[PDB]
Amino acid sequence: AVSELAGHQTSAESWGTGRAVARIPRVRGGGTHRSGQGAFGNMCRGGRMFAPTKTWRRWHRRVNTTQKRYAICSALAASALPALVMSKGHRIEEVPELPLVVEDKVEGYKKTKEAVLLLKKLKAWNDIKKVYASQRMRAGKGKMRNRRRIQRRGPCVIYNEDNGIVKAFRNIPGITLLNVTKLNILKLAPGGHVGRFCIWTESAFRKLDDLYGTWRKAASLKSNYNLPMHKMLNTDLSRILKSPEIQRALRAPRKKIH
Amino acid sequence: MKFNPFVTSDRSKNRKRHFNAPSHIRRKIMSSPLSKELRQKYNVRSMPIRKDDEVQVVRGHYKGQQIGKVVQVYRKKYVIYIERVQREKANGTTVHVGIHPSKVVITRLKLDKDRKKILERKAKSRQVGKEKGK
Amino acid sequence: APSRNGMILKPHFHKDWQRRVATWFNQPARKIRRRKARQARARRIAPRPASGPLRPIVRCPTVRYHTKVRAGRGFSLEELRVAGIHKKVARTIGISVDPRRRNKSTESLQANVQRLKEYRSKLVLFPRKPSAPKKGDSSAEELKLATQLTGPVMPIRN
RNA sequence: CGACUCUUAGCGGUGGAUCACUCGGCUCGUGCGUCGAUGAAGAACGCAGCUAGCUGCGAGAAUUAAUGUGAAUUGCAGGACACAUUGAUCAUCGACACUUCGAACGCACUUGCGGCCCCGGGUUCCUCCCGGGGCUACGCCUGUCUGAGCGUCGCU
RNA sequence: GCGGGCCCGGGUGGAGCCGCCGCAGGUGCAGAUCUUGGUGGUAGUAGCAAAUAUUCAAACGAGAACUUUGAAGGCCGAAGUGGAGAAGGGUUCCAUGUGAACAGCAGUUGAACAUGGGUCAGUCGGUCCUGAGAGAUGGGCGAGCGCCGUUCCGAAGGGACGG
RNA sequence: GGUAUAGGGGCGAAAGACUAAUCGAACCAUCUAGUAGCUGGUUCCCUCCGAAGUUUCCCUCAGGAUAGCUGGCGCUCUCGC
RNA sequence: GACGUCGGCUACCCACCCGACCCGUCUUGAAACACGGACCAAGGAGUCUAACACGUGCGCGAGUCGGGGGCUCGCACGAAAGCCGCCGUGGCGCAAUGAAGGUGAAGGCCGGCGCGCUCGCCGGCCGAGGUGGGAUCCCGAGGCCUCUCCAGUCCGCCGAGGGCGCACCACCGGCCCGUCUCGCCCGCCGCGCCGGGGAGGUGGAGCACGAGCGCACGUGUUAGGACCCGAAAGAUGGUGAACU
RNA sequence: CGCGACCUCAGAUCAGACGUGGCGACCCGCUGAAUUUAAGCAUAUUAGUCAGCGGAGGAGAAGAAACUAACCAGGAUUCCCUCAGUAACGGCGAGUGAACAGGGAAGAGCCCAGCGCCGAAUCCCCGCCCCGCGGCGGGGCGCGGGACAUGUGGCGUACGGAAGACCCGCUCCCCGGCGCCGCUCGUGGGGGGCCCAAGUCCUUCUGAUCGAGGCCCAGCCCGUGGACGGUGUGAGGCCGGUAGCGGCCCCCGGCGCGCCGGGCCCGGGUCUUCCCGGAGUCGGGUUGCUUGGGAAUGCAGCCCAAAGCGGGUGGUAAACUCCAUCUAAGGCUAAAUACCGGCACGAGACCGAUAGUCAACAAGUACCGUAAGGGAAAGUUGAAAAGAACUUUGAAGAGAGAGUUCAAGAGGGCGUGAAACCGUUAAGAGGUAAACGGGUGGGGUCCGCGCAGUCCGCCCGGUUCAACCCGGCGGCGGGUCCGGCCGU
Ligand SMILES: [Mg+2]
Ligand SMILES: [Mg+2]
Ligand SMILES: [Mg+2]
Ligand SMILES: [Mg+2]
Ligand SMILES: [Mg+2]
Ligand SMILES: [Mg+2]
Ligand SMILES: [Mg+2]
Ligand SMILES: [Mg+2]
Ligand SMILES: [Mg+2]
Ligand SMILES: [Mg+2]
Ligand SMILES: [Mg+2]
Ligand SMILES: [Mg+2]
Ligand SMILES: [Mg+2]
Ligand SMILES: [Mg+2]
Ligand SMILES: [Mg+2]
Ligand SMILES: [Mg+2]
Ligand SMILES: [Mg+2]
Ligand SMILES: [Mg+2]
Ligand SMILES: [Mg+2]
Ligand SMILES: [Mg+2]
Ligand SMILES: [Mg+2]
Ligand SMILES: [Mg+2]
Ligand SMILES: [Mg+2]
Ligand SMILES: [Mg+2]
Ligand SMILES: [Mg+2]
Ligand SMILES: [Mg+2]
Ligand SMILES: [Mg+2]
Ligand SMILES: [Mg+2]
Ligand SMILES: [Mg+2]
Ligand SMILES: [Mg+2]
Ligand SMILES: [Mg+2]
Ligand SMILES: [Mg+2]
Ligand SMILES: [Mg+2]
């Protein structure tokens, strides 16, 4: 916000009618340039901005807990479906399996060389290569506001418990580390886009059913929560349209252009 | 990534600290790397430049393999003057061309008691660090 | 000016309310400071409960509730006399004592006396000096636990 | 085809718009949260080899001492230092120092007039005179000393 | 491309910039006798006309109507265009030098600019006294900063001689 | 020359005169971005729809409320099936 | 027709024919002898908070919620995010009506007991009444046929006609609370200035098998400076008699 | 006729201390409006707000019921949510508007007067001795002084207390010093100082790389370090830093150990006997202000003016009658709370020199007014001054050559350099002011051809493998579901 005193620190009175001036408050007296000039107006030099910004703007917004869980579940489900991950731009071509789950020994890593070797073995290093190729200077006033460097977001690593894995996967650009019990939608869906490539750990992967549960079981870690129900089950429209049951109850189409 | 909540990490503030540093801090700022032979011998990465060292220019117009003595250290301008790194003025007067210490490699140190103490401290700290690494 | 069936509203913004606007950007910092102070206070009294002294059983007035049971300020002097604890000694062992609370019903008196007896049963009175004087518990039940008691002592359940 | 005038273009003028830069602001948050009669805030006057302003300093006046670091400051000369030496500059700063007004304190505000003690010049305390040093404001508490009362009493 | 505008070519420029999917706003100017800054016609125009008046020769000087010197003609005509002060000004005073800017023409001149220099008290005044008046203490008032009042509801002289 | 009278106050041989170029109530700062049913202005394109100056009430007549005129969003149905 | 010749709607200049008054604003009426306007560049005016109403999107749903607090990080990304016997203290909704003392939403049918007395009491049954219009669904005679005559289960379209009838509308009934009139009976711990029930009108923002809660977006009305600029005024505290 | 005590009252350059002023963002005590709204306006609202005065601290104030309630009761104060835009107030208009309970943050209780018991058992000052003395204390020795009986100290205060009787088990807390080991959570408490990884590798651009290509795996090495800044562009590895339960060197703070000087003969339960309360105060009338408080919520000037199974409260005034709840008119106290000023840090979906504080710069500066006060404009050469030597015309300002630089087509208010406006050059035109819309024509500017541009793309006529077999590899679909898994 701007200062409350901005523009009103002067003592300016408007010269009355009968003078060539245009009825604007002007600086009183003095032998200065800033004398009989103009103040208190949004159109005047110095002046005061129209509707000055206030600190008590509604900066923070509120979202329902159930909707937040819905969104995080949708993002987690969209972490599958390699088409969506490819649509996010992640170089996932050579990854052996998109639901990439790795052993629990990764938490025991404590050096960056082990982390990069594991990433190359899993063939997820191409994402880091793309992140490296994406490093450049930001355009605009952000450079002088501690936002000079920008780069592409890379793969996300989800672990069950912290045993030094973060320090290993800390100096690799683009890698974000999340815990299963405190998954963040802001990092699972960067930019509001539901696609994201994630690397799972076996314990973290097994904890997913304990975190949210299935449709026939409760979460067992959230007091009252179940997975949302599907509005439609057979999502494949092409299979439904050409099904024999539908085709038996259709008229002959008219495609003769007149 | 920096984690200490008492470091600057601010563009304007870091620039202000750099350009308003006192003389003793500017001495540490004006540091130059040692040669490969000196790095192997003393096990020291770099040392602050001094008035009586031998200097090779690594970058710039005067880049070359020549070895020149330091003439003076100008801490106000963050620059040093070298022996043969000089230019001719309009009237024929010779003027030293300033070379930043970061673009300079030391090939021979001016060893005094304090220089030896600094070398020993740096070597011992590096040894402690590598022992911690192992 | 009214216009085709709106509510009649009387906002209380006729004073200079913008002068006394209280923002809440201090809320997370306040919570962090409170948590740090709470942890420091818990660490200062290493074996004593972090919640504090034991609280009595209290029933609420104002027939609206009339049935809930909450924690009181302290045990009345009659309850201490029945349980056999000196009022001045009790505050030094972690028992809340207040002298204003009356005692009308026998049921509340008996419930609080039983609560005091139960608290005394599960109490580990450390010796004043390394040598064990009278009323001090054995060294067997001193190394077995020296940790805080998270949450309220003997939580009240309706 | 002249001169003048009108439009467009190239170049050259007045002007400083736009863009990119920023040791500056605005907003939020954290810790701490400390002035003064042992003289505060503020003001005046002075202090550098060459010095106007800003900043810093107080007749020890661009800084003294001590600690840490360790070879400069620099616009020019001069140089102190031997940088194998508490040792140049810097930062810290705990020792010392800190002109005149100002709650401002001998009386007033002119920088004018005084009183009480000590020392020196003059003397051989001799008072004039000169210089230096320490005191001399209001209110108030405890205590001391000297006092007043046709206040209340006791002896003669 | 109906349009809001946009994409390329050339020149200058020297260090950052844009498209797409979403988010947010101090987000689009022809006017408000709008605010700030700059520039035209007017216009080489109005004007450089209150108080009688200048001329000759020489010198310095690149340069002379305006400087200096000499001569001539004039005016102010002792309630002066003379000689000294008070208030005010504050270096404007003096010597040397420059002619960037100012002295509404010019200048070799200046109260301009740059270097230096200059104010000497027992007797001349402040300092002393009181006037009209102002203003403490005592006293009274006042929520309070303070105010009333100058002898009024005061144990108000700390001085002196002789012993 | 010194001194005294200071703003709903002073002073006035009296003109509402003077009170620092302002006096039928000085100047400075703040309340204050005082209020205005009254003037002036109110910033890109295209497409579609498209008015009223009329009834009643109001210390109401240069203004409002209320009906009327307008736009947008729909919904319930019928059908050149 | 092809080495000084081609195509270039739009823009550079000029000419000709026709048309053609300077923009913005108040206004019934502006080119006006109505007001603002020399020219250029930059800045410049419907914003934010809170309260409502409606519409729209999302999640849950007779429930919904995160206010505040607490547990995880030493804040890079974070003052975020995740969680809570706090999952609900508490708000909103699920019940309304009277000033209040208070009361407070279902009836109908069948057989019996009092005289079925449109009144009271016993057992069983159906469980938001009925009428009209009602999108859609059910039955559906029969027809259309099929290379010849008959029989014929099957895949069809139309299908007169007959029904169950969403949502909603209109009406007739029913129930709840206040009030008015006429009345007959029921119960007791205390038999009373006790309490309860009926019929017929009327008043209510009600019930009659529910729809809200939270978040976000837009519009409209307000309190705030409130689209921007503009007074003649009023109050508080201080400075001036160097003019007069 | 004086002296000696006491009570009231003066003088001190008497001995030793204390207050004065400043800041004032947050806090406490007073005083205290009008703009504005009510479409006018006088009660109301603005508003216990601004202005004015006084007084502190790191917080302040408040604070342990003369309380809330009427319930099966709760239990100091402060703050958050809710209560609640509710009860209530109000030309009952505009508008104003709490409290209780409930959930939390924090949580800590106490001391006098009086009543009474102890030989004043109490306190201050001066002298000497011992310790330490830079936030002047402890002990001892002084017929050394003073204060105090017009009352100091010990026990003891509403939750009862004191003294005896005799039931029960037994004897460590605090203050001032002397030193000592553990370096005491942001994972070593606070402050300061010195240090700890890896390319200037090979070509290639450039004035200069930090650019581009490549280097046992995105490439060479480090990575618990890939933040940031500087270095002649755009640097993880050139430099400072960055990460680290990383190191070393000093000071300070805090918790614990042994010693010395000390102070300290300190209980619970029952019974018995006594004792136990703050006066011009409560309360009443009154009037003024204030409040939601309405026959009067609180604060008050004046008058009246108490009692002790009394007094206060129980939200409608009064009488009678029972109930419930506290004990006013004396005092202290941290925590959860606030912080547009001061000291030192961190951050940003904020502005980017007419913006952002008035002030990015010698800014509360220059300058204006007698004064209270008013108050600006103003950033950018270049990587490096390498800031143009020298020759020539001019008195000089100014030019012409030369030189530096990648570039002065960057020359000391010098980055980029628009429009208004001006000079000149090239072209066109010109007696109905200029300018504008529609339609053509003429002349220029370059653009795209072309020395024909006759444009191609399929089918047809005039050196090896497809056809067809062998082997291998991979894939598609199928059902006897052939068999198992998978799966409703
Ligand atoms: Mg708690
Ligand atoms: Mg003329
Ligand atoms: Mg005459
Ligand atoms: Mg004269
Ligand atoms: Mg002169
Ligand atoms: Mg002139
Ligand atoms: Mg008259
Ligand atoms: Mg306005
Ligand atoms: Mg009107
Ligand atoms: Mg329409
Ligand atoms: Mg139309
Ligand atoms: Mg009009
Ligand atoms: Mg008219
Ligand atoms: Mg018009
Ligand atoms: Mg005009
Ligand atoms: Mg603009
Ligand atoms: Mg509406
Ligand atoms: Mg105004
Ligand atoms: Mg008035
Ligand atoms: Mg009004
Ligand atoms: Mg009005
Ligand atoms: Mg009015
Ligand atoms: Mg009021
Ligand atoms: Mg207190
Ligand atoms: Mg309470
Ligand atoms: Mg409500
Ligand atoms: Mg006593
Ligand atoms: Mg850089
Ligand atoms: Mg870098
Ligand atoms: Mg390094
Ligand atoms: Mg009553
Ligand atoms: Mg500015
Ligand atoms: Mg330029």
PDB file of N, CA and C (backbone and C1' of nucleotides) in Angstrom, chain F residues 14-27:
ATOM      1  P     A F  14     -13.040  60.732  12.855  1.00  0.00           P
ATOM      2  O5'   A F  14     -14.130  59.782  12.186  1.00  0.00           O
ATOM      3  C5'   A F  14     -15.423  60.274  11.845  1.00  0.00           C
ATOM      4  C4'   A F  14     -16.434  59.160  11.743  1.00  0.00           C
ATOM      5  C3'   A F  14     -17.857  59.543  12.138  1.00  0.00           C
ATOM      6  O3'   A F  14     -18.788  58.758  11.395  1.00  0.00           O
ATOM      7  C1'   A F  14     -17.057  57.871  13.603  1.00  0.00           C
ATOM      8  P     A F  15     -19.310  59.258   9.961  1.00  0.00           P
ATOM      9  O5'   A F  15     -18.249  58.653   8.941  1.00  0.00           O
ATOM     10  C5'   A F  15     -18.432  58.770   7.539  1.00  0.00           C
ATOM     11  C4'   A F  15     -17.557  57.798   6.790  1.00  0.00           C
ATOM     12  C3'   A F  15     -17.770  56.329   7.108  1.00  0.00           C
ATOM     13  O3'   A F  15     -18.898  55.769   6.462  1.00  0.00           O
ATOM     14  C1'   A F  15     -15.458  56.803   7.105  1.00  0.00           C
ATOM     15  P     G F  16     -20.015  55.008   7.330  1.00  0.00           P
ATOM     16  O5'   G F  16     -19.288  53.678   7.810  1.00  0.00           O
ATOM     17  C5'   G F  16     -18.901  52.684   6.876  1.00  0.00           C
ATOM     18  C4'   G F  16     -17.724  51.884   7.376  1.00  0.00           C
ATOM     19  C3'   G F  16     -17.505  50.537   6.694  1.00  0.00           C
ATOM     20  O3'   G F  16     -16.765  50.569   5.472  1.00  0.00           O
ATOM     21  C1'   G F  16     -17.545  50.229   9.035  1.00  0.00           C
ATOM     22  P     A F  17     -16.079  51.898   4.860  1.00  0.00           P
ATOM     23  O5'   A F  17     -15.067  52.405   5.979  1.00  0.00           O
ATOM     24  C5'   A F  17     -13.745  51.893   6.042  1.00  0.00           C
ATOM     25  C4'   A F  17     -12.796  52.863   6.696  1.00  0.00           C
ATOM     26  C3'   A F  17     -11.471  52.273   7.157  1.00  0.00           C
ATOM     27  O3'   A F  17     -10.523  52.177   6.108  1.00  0.00           O
ATOM     28  C1'   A F  17     -12.398  53.591   8.889  1.00  0.00           C
ATOM     29  P     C F  18      -9.819  50.772   5.783  1.00  0.00           P
ATOM     30  O5'   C F  18      -8.665  50.659   6.873  1.00  0.00           O
ATOM     31  C5'   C F  18      -7.614  51.610   6.918  1.00  0.00           C
ATOM     32  C4'   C F  18      -6.834  51.516   8.204  1.00  0.00           C
ATOM     33  C3'   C F  18      -6.347  50.130   8.594  1.00  0.00           C
ATOM     34  O3'   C F  18      -5.178  49.730   7.901  1.00  0.00           O
ATOM     35  C1'   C F  18      -7.311  51.181  10.473  1.00  0.00           C
ATOM     36  P     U F  19      -4.944  48.180   7.550  1.00  0.00           P
ATOM     37  O5'   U F  19      -4.677  47.496   8.964  1.00  0.00           O
ATOM     38  C5'   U F  19      -3.579  47.888   9.776  1.00  0.00           C
ATOM     39  C4'   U F  19      -3.636  47.231  11.131  1.00  0.00           C
ATOM     40  C3'   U F  19      -3.739  45.716  11.126  1.00  0.00           C
ATOM     41  O3'   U F  19      -2.490  45.083  10.920  1.00  0.00           O
ATOM     42  C1'   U F  19      -5.303  46.610  12.658  1.00  0.00           C
ATOM     43  P     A F  20      -2.350  43.922   9.823  1.00  0.00           P
ATOM     44  O5'   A F  20      -1.063  44.336   8.983  1.00  0.00           O
ATOM     45  C5'   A F  20      -1.103  45.424   8.064  1.00  0.00           C
ATOM     46  C4'   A F  20       0.143  45.482   7.212  1.00  0.00           C
ATOM     47  C3'   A F  20       0.460  44.208   6.434  1.00  0.00           C
ATOM     48  O3'   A F  20       1.079  44.548   5.193  1.00  0.00           O
ATOM     49  C1'   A F  20       2.236  44.687   7.924  1.00  0.00           C
ATOM     50  P     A F  21       0.361  44.166   3.807  1.00  0.00           P
ATOM     51  O5'   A F  21       0.702  45.382   2.837  1.00  0.00           O
ATOM     52  C5'   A F  21      -0.074  46.576   2.864  1.00  0.00           C
ATOM     53  C4'   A F  21      -0.865  46.765   1.592  1.00  0.00           C
ATOM     54  C3'   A F  21      -1.883  45.670   1.286  1.00  0.00           C
ATOM     55  O3'   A F  21      -3.013  46.244   0.630  1.00  0.00           O
ATOM     56  C1'   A F  21      -0.295  45.783  -0.464  1.00  0.00           C
ATOM     57  P     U F  22      -4.416  46.351   1.401  1.00  0.00           P
ATOM     58  O5'   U F  22      -4.825  44.836   1.664  1.00  0.00           O
ATOM     59  C5'   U F  22      -5.509  44.082   0.674  1.00  0.00           C
ATOM     60  C4'   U F  22      -6.483  43.120   1.304  1.00  0.00           C
ATOM     61  C3'   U F  22      -7.225  43.649   2.520  1.00  0.00           C
ATOM     62  O3'   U F  22      -8.347  44.440   2.170  1.00  0.00           O
ATOM     63  C1'   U F  22      -6.375  41.492   2.987  1.00  0.00           C
ATOM     64  P     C F  23      -8.688  45.773   2.996  1.00  0.00           P
ATOM     65  O5'   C F  23      -9.678  45.270   4.135  1.00  0.00           O
ATOM     66  C5'   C F  23     -10.833  44.503   3.814  1.00  0.00           C
ATOM     67  C4'   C F  23     -11.685  44.243   5.032  1.00  0.00           C
ATOM     68  C3'   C F  23     -12.173  45.491   5.765  1.00  0.00           C
ATOM     69  O3'   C F  23     -13.467  45.247   6.310  1.00  0.00           O
ATOM     70  C1'   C F  23     -10.874  44.173   7.232  1.00  0.00           C
ATOM     71  P     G F  24     -14.640  46.329   6.124  1.00  0.00           P
ATOM     72  O5'   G F  24     -15.899  45.651   6.825  1.00  0.00           O
ATOM     73  C5'   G F  24     -15.746  44.869   8.004  1.00  0.00           C
ATOM     74  C4'   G F  24     -16.948  43.992   8.253  1.00  0.00           C
ATOM     75  C3'   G F  24     -17.283  43.012   7.133  1.00  0.00           C
ATOM     76  O3'   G F  24     -17.825  41.816   7.694  1.00  0.00           O
ATOM     77  C1'   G F  24     -19.101  44.496   7.458  1.00  0.00           C
ATOM     78  P     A F  25     -17.044  40.422   7.533  1.00  0.00           P
ATOM     79  O5'   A F  25     -15.909  40.481   8.649  1.00  0.00           O
ATOM     80  C5'   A F  25     -14.570  40.841   8.321  1.00  0.00           C
ATOM     81  C4'   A F  25     -13.624  40.568   9.465  1.00  0.00           C
ATOM     82  C3'   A F  25     -13.472  39.098   9.852  1.00  0.00           C
ATOM     83  O3'   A F  25     -12.150  38.875  10.341  1.00  0.00           O
ATOM     84  C1'   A F  25     -14.338  40.309  11.686  1.00  0.00           C
ATOM     85  P     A F  26     -11.222  37.739   9.688  1.00  0.00           P
ATOM     86  O5'   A F  26      -9.786  38.422   9.603  1.00  0.00           O
ATOM     87  C5'   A F  26      -9.510  39.427   8.641  1.00  0.00           C
ATOM     88  C4'   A F  26      -8.037  39.744   8.589  1.00  0.00           C
ATOM     89  C3'   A F  26      -7.116  38.557   8.358  1.00  0.00           C
ATOM     90  O3'   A F  26      -7.007  38.213   6.987  1.00  0.00           O
ATOM     91  C1'   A F  26      -6.300  39.847  10.161  1.00  0.00           C
ATOM     92  P     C F  27      -6.982  36.674   6.531  1.00  0.00           P
ATOM     93  O5'   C F  27      -5.511  36.189   6.896  1.00  0.00           O
ATOM     94  C5'   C F  27      -4.370  36.851   6.372  1.00  0.00           C
ATOM     95  C4'   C F  27      -3.120  36.439   7.103  1.00  0.00           C
ATOM     96  C3'   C F  27      -2.901  34.939   7.226  1.00  0.00           C
ATOM     97  O3'   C F  27      -2.301  34.380   6.072  1.00  0.00           O
ATOM     98  C1'   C F  27      -2.592  35.957   9.338  1.00  0.00           C
TER      99        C F  27
END
